[PDB]
């Protein structure tokens, strides 16, 4: 039971995915071809959560790779851990999207999505008790954004009682990365608000800040960014794969993190984040870890959480630790700075812990924040949208594929309503 089906969509989604599968492989003692070389039975206890088993003690990611844009997935295939994936789980088309949500969601994507659905259905049958679907995509592209949304819609329709979580790479609002990005992001957000249970919002600006300010690093590559994302992802599902004291789960996190159904946009983080060079200068106390977790500079969304109240926060620890220390730390944090946590929810925090630290660390932790401050992100996107749409700039590319003006307007309206709702709890 507790089995998860993974989907990766578009270029970004595929790239992050590759890293994710490397990291999970490492964690579960799977070598690049798919053989197990672990020394602990803990490693295989719940290996089924991510991997199917095949003849000859072969383990295969329960993973589907989708891209209308071909060649990105060819790179994945050519890569080191590319050989672990099932060839029949590569679903790809013969035309790009030109960063066009409409082509991903309405036309080109609609032609490919049937295949993906078929594969998903097949995957679902090998679940004893399907926990849900985990998606990796990007907002600002065409495939991950449009087709990702399309696929999500379909899957929710077919499996409405299973959990739908998305790790979505959003724009960097201070320095935007395509021209039609705002249009795409706005169109996707509309779909995600309605058709997912949780969305982890990751932005490259924040990642770079983390790399530079916190980790004291330079020359960071997309690979490194993917690594960081993958670590958070793995952290999220640790309690489904392994033992512990308080064990989390997807819906458990959703239960503690989503106090109103539409407010399900999270800012993920990891701790510790210090330099590789200056290792010995610091040590691993639970208080230090929590400090790292909670500090704005260590978050991977493009907000100052200090410009808003936390509705709820989930901390997931790995390593054998004093629960007293944990709880007391949380309490102290709440007491000292009660203004940053909304006063209408007693005990805004949540703890979970797993007796199994990942590779090097003795103590690691994953942060999941739901703050009213995230309104800023949406607000800026809506500002961007309006400036263009009021002049109908770039709109012909979308109307040409059968999209209507009214839809755009409605999407904007929904985005604004989201912002308003967030402001309510601020």
């Amino acid at each position: 039971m507790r089995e998860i089906v993974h989907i990766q969509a578009g270029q970004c989604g595929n790239q992050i995915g590759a890293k994710f599968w490397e990291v999970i492989s490492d964690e579960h003692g799977i070598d690049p071809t798919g053989s197990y070389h672990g020394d602990s039975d803990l490693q295989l206890e719940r290996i089924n959560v991510y991997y199917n088993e095949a003849a000859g003690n072969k383990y295969v990611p329960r993973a589907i790779l989708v891209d209308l844009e071909p060649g990105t997935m060819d790179s994945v295939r050519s890569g080191p851990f590319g050989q672990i994936f099932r060839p029949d789980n590569f679903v790809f088309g013969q035309s790009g999207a030109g960063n066009n949500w409409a082509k991903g969601h309405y036309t080109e994507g609609a032609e490919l999505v049937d295949s993906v659905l078929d594969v998903v259905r097949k995957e679902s049958e090998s679940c004893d008790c399907l926990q849900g679907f985990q998606l990796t995509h990007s907002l600002g592209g065409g495939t991950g954004s449009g087709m990702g949304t399309l696929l999500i819609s379909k899957i929710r329709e077919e499996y409405p009682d299973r959990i739908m979580n998305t790790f979505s790479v959003v724009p960097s609002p201070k320095v935007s990365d395509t021209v039609v990005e705002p249009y795409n992001a706005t169109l996707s957000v509309h779909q995600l608000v309605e058709n997912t249970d949780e969305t982890y919002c990751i932005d490259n600006e924040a990642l770079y800040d983390i790399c530079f300010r916190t980790l004291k690093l330079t020359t960071p590559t997309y690979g490194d960014l993917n690594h960081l994302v993958s670590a958070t992802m793995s952290g999220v599902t640790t309690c489904l794969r392994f033992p512990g004291q308080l064990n989390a789960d997807l819906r458990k996190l959703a239960v503690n993190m989503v106090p109103f159904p539409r407010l399900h946009f999270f800012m993920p983080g990891f701790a510790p984040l210090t330099s590789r060079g200056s290792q010995q200068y610091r040590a691993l106390t639970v208080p230090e870890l929590t400090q790292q977790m909670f500090d704005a500079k260590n978050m991977m969304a493009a907000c100052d959480p200090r410009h808003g109240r936390y509705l709820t926060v989930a901390a997931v620890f790995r390593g054998r630790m004093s629960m007293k220390e944990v709880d007391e730390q949380m309490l102290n944090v709440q007491n000292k700075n009660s203004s940053y946590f909304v006063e209408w929810i007693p005990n805004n925090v949540k703890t979970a812990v797993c007796d199994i630290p990942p590779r090097g660390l003795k103590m690691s932790a994953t942060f999941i924040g739901n703050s009213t401050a995230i309104q800023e992100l949406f607000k800026r996107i809506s500002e961007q949208f309006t400036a263009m749409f009021r002049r109908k700039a770039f709109l012909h590319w979308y109307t040409g594929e059968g999209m209507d003006e009214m839809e755009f307007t409605e999407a904007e309206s929904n985005m604004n309503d989201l912002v308003s709702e967030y402001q309510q709890y601020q």
């Binding site: 719940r46 064990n247 503690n256 629960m323 007293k324 709880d327 929810i345 007693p346 949540k350």
Partner: protein, 427 residues
């Protein structure tokens, strides 16, 4: 004989149960594999000689029970006593009850029936859950309800993990706990409640440990459980059967909540800087910080108190101690109860596990207390719930699985009534 069954439900409950079983194995001489006199109260007598416990082990979470099934205390357990499903409630009262639990519950009932079929005088049950955790609150409530239909005359005692006022774990506890209270109330007899903050405080002061775990907590709980139960199993001057804890502790048939506290809880270091006499132990028992919940008991009259002395104990000394306690002005008591204290004195002492910090003591005590001072905590909980519910926090989750919101209102009303009753008692 006075021969009975236990129930350990949800993650926390299961953890507690492991510790309990370990303690029992230590006490009765049983080796982790079932090999070795009066043990048989729990360990229903067996085929080839190797003893097997009578406990209901239930978790809709697979993981915790899976761990148990590959542990040391492994073959000891029957495969069936341990039960499994698929997924957590995730602190969701509307899943242990109503939706997902109404499926497994039948199996659990069957198991219980089977266990009963070995008793020649089933004195009742011990139930381990959590006022908070999703499985062990809704599901446990459901189970208790079911038991009420199938065993009307049999006692059903509960060991409960009340959430401490300040500290928290999962931020939907105030709903769940209240729901449990609403649906447990009339089906249980007694609900022995222990906080965690209090325990931590005790550890910091009394045991001189500032880096605790859950394991330690579990061990402590198990100790208390052992103290409660030992009169069933071993000999004694005065033997307190399970059915006494109804009649010497429930002054009215809705007030089902006692505070369970233990002494001496002091490590080897300044144990030898102490006498550990009976009177001292008794005094320790009635002090505020040594209590295993967060009440200021000086803010609340005692209704019924019950003490379970173990080891080298002379009744005269106990009597003297009790007299002294009675004399004290700060240890308040109700207008309507003169005979406030119930005493059990047992010739067998407590037994200490390897790893358990509490050192070997010739004499020890477990105290059980009903007071108006528990009401503070209840009030706090109610307040929390009210603050949550007015803005409709996370209500759609429980309602979205299968619930009326009027249920919540009913629960609140019940709580209010309870509070009123407590006030009346105080008067």
């Amino acid at each position: 004989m006075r021969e009975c069954i236990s129930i350990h439900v949800g993650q926390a409950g299961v953890q507690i149960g492991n510790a309990c079983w370990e303690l029992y194995c230590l006490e009765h001489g049983i080796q982790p594999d079932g090999q070795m006199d009066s043990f048989n109260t729990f360990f229903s007598e067996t085929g080839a000689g190797k003893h097997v416990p009578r406990a209901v082990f239930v978790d809709l979470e697979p993981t915790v029970i899976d761990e148990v099934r590959t542990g040391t205390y492994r073959q000891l357990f029957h495969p069936e006593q341990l039960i499994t499903g698929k997924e957590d409630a995730a602190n969701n009262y509307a899943r242990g009850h109503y939706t997902i639990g109404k499926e497994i519950i039948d199996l659990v009932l069957d198991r219980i029936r089977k266990l009963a079929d070995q008793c020649t005088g089933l004195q009742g049950f011990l139930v381990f859950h959590s006022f908070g955790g999703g499985t062990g609150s809704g599901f446990t409530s459901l189970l208790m309800e079911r038991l009420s239909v199938d065993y009307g005359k049999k006692s059903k005692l509960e060991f409960s993990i009340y959430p401490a006022p300040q500290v928290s774990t999962a931020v939907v506890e105030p709903y769940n706990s209240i729901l449990t209270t609403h649906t447990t109330l009339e089906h249980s007899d007694c609900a022995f409640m222990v906080d965690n903050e209090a325990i931590y405080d005790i550890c910091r002061r009394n045991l001189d440990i500032e880096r605790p775990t859950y394991t330690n907590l579990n061990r402590l709980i198990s100790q208390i459980v052992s103290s409660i139960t030992a009169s069933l199993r071993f000999d004694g001057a005065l033997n307190v059967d399970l059915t006494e804890f109804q009649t010497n502790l429930v002054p009215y048939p809705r007030i089902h909540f006692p505070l369970a506290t233990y002494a001496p809880v002091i490590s080897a270091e300044k144990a030898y800087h102490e006498q550990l006499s009976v009177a001292e132990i008794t005094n320790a028992c009635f002090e505020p910080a040594n209590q295993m919940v967060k009440c200021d008991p000086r803010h609340g009259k005692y209704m019924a108190c019950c003490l379970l002395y173990r080891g080298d104990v002379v009744p005269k000394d106990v009597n003297a101690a009790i007299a002294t306690i009675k004399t004290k002005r700060t240890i308040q008591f109700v207008d309507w109860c003169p005979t406030g204290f119930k005493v059990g004195i047992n010739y067998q002492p407590p037994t200490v596990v390897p790893g358990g910090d509490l050192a070997k003591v010739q004499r020890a005590v477990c105290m059980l207390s009903n007071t108006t001072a528990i009401a503070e905590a209840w009030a706090r909980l109610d307040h929390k719930f009210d603050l949550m519910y007015a803005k409709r926090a996370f209500v759609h989750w429980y309602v979205g699985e299968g619930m009326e919101e009027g249920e919540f209102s009913e629960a609140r009303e019940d709580m209010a009534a309870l509070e009123k009753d407590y006030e009346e008692v105080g008067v």
